[PDB]
Design a protein around this ligand. Structure first.
Ligand SMILES: Nc1ncnc2c1ncn2[C@@H]1O[C@H](COP(=O)(O)O)[C@@H](O)[C@H]1O
Length: 327
């Protein structure tokens, strides 16, 4: 919040507005409870009036994922209040995505011990009928505010829907997302440089032209001298040499998506993802690394300054190491 938020606004502003095409296949599931199927995303989480208790209709705890995710329904829309395992990574990552062109959900950090922090907590305590909000959030030093994203996670794609959703476009985006995860060593989402069975929960497809919107983005700097280094270089090399054919790695990741969705967007699809992945790498090579490092440091500064939130000291040099390899 504060400087950080401004920096976010700036980045967010630069993102290419997504399609104006609403894909009915991505519409959230119709179930105090919030009907995500018809709920509208609260417009500006930079401005939330915690003192106007009458604007609030209720709060629901998402029984999925972390556990600490709540949907707040005001009269102006719905936003999300969430407990985060690693808030610094998550938020810092959110920014990085937006910087790389990715449509992450707008996120804002609220310090528990601040005027707004206390105000918000008092508001939630007033509206919570579950008796679980305060006990889960009040404990935290910083709480996360998030933009409601209307869509569904990749896993939840049927097969009878996948065709109209997994267009060339979506695929390329997916490709890009992978590049990012590589840069930050995020093994959770889409494996490529990790034997993990991945996890498609961490990725949503917005109704807005099925645009890919990542979630629970995290960073884990495996620095100094590790396999990741050559591994990505290799993949890259092969990819560049003859991008006309589905590399071993993308074939693997293709399979995965093929599994959860039971839909094989064979070869043509894999190539698309490869394209997107490259497109991003290419972009990343053009980065004036001195400037970028500063951009990075600005975020870190803002993080530390607005909330005592220090991100790992190896984070930046790592993301930079990777970024250099794309050169
Ligand atoms: N911005 C968002 N909009 C809608 N659902 C979300 C959003 N962020 C996270 N979720 C979800 O809530 C579930 C659990 O979130 P998470 O604990 O962060 O994995 C996810 O599978 C999604 O349905």
């Amino acid at each position: 919040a504060g400087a950080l938020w401004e920096i976010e606004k700036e980045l967010f502003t630069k993102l290419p507005a997504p399609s104006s095409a609403i894909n009915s296949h991505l519409q959230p599931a119709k179930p105090f409870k919030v009907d995500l199927s018809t709920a509208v995303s609260y417009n500006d989480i930079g401005d939330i009036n915690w003192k106007n208790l009458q604007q609030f209709k209720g709060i629901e705890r998402s029984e999925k994922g972390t556990e600490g995710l709540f949907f707040v329904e005001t009269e102006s829309g719905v936003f999300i209040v969430k407990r985060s395992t690693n808030i610094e990574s998550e938020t810092f990552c959110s920014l990085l995505c937006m910087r790389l062109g990715l449509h992450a959900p707008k996120v804002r950090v609220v310090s528990s011990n601040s005027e707004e922090g206390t105000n918000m907590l008092e508001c939630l305590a007033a509206i919570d009928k579950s008796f679980r909000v305060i006990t889960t959030l009040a404990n935290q030093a910083n709480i996360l505010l998030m933009e409601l994203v209307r869509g569904i996670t990749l896993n939840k794609l049927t097969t009878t829907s996948a065709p109209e959703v997994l267009t060339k476009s979506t695929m390329q985006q997916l490709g890009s997302l992978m590049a990012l995860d590589v840069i930050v060593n995020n093994s959770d989402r889409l494996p490529i440089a990790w034997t993990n069975e991945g996890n498609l929960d961490n990725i949503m497809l917005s109704e807005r032209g099925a645009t890919v919107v990542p979630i629970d983005s995290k960073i884990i700097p495996l620095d100094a001298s590790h396999p990741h280094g050559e591994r990505v270089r290799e993949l890259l090399r092969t990819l560049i040499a003859h991008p006309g054919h589905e590399s071993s790695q993308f074939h693997s990741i293709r399979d995965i998506i093929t599994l959860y969705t039971g839909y094989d967007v064979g070869t043509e699809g894999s190539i698309s993802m490869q394209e997107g992945f490259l497109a991003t790498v290419r972009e990343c090579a053009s980065f004036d690394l001195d400037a970028f490092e500063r951009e990075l440091l600005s975020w870190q500064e803002s993080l530390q300054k607005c909330h005592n939130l220090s991100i790992s000291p190896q984070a930046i040099p790592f993301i930079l190491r990777m970024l250099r390899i794309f050169h």
